[PDB]
Amino acid sequence: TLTKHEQDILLKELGPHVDTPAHIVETGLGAYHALFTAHPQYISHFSRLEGHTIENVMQSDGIKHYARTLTEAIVHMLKEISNDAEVKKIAAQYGKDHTSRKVTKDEFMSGEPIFTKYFQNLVADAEGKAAVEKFLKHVFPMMAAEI
Numbered sequence: 001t002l003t004k005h006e007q008d009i010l011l012k013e014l015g016p017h018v019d020t021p022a023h024i025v026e027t028g029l030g031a032y033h034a035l036f037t038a039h040p041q042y043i044s045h046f047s048r049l050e051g052h053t054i055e056n057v058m059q060s061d062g063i064k065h066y067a068r069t070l071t072e073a074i075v076h077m078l079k080e081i082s083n084d085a086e087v088k089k090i091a092a093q094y095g096k097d098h099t100s101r102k103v104t105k106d107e108f109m110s111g112e113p114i115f116t117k118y119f120q121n122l123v124a125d126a127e128g129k130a131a132v133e134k135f136l137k138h139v140f141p142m143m144a145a146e147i
């Protein structure tokens with residue numbers, strides 16, 4: 001798992017992407033955009049997005065809700081990453097929050113490489129890009145266990 005320094009560095013580099021209400025939504029939007037471009041069939045699995053296509057999903061109201069809650073969840077896990085017990089608990093709950101019968105463990109897990117590339121591209125440098133991957137590779141399976 002992340003060392004204290006890796007957590008600090010990642011928080012620093014993600015900070016300017018997760019500060020303002022707008023940036024928090026913006027960050028989440030990009031992640032889902034990447035996800036739906038690779039897997040447009042996942043769109044209909046998000047209840048608020050039903051009927052949208054990849055052509056128009058980014059303009060829905062629903063995607064802003066999802067964008068906000070995604071960014072918030074990622075940041076929350078990052079902030080607790082040095083608390084083994086807490087991050088495990090938070091991660092498990094976020095997995096459980098994926099109640100929809102439309103989403104499976106395997107579908108969830110397929111988002112890992114996509115979110116990894118996205119967040120790596122979003123952060124500034126090599127040290128942050130490596131920390132992103134270590135961070136996501138660690139937390140994806142934690143959440144998926146409860147899906």
Ligand code: HEM
Nearest residue numbers: 045046047048069070073074094097098100103107108111
């Ligand atoms: C970094 C990894 C992820 C995190 C932290 C995350 C977080 C969340 C959170 C917090 C919610 C609840 C939002 C609410 O109603 O309050 C949610 C919903 C959802 N997520 Fe994720 N998610 C992640 C990855 C994915 C992936 C890759 C998929 C695609 C398989 C996915 C599919 C869904 C679906 C279908 C919902 C339910 C939308 C609803 O019921 O309205 N998530 N996600």
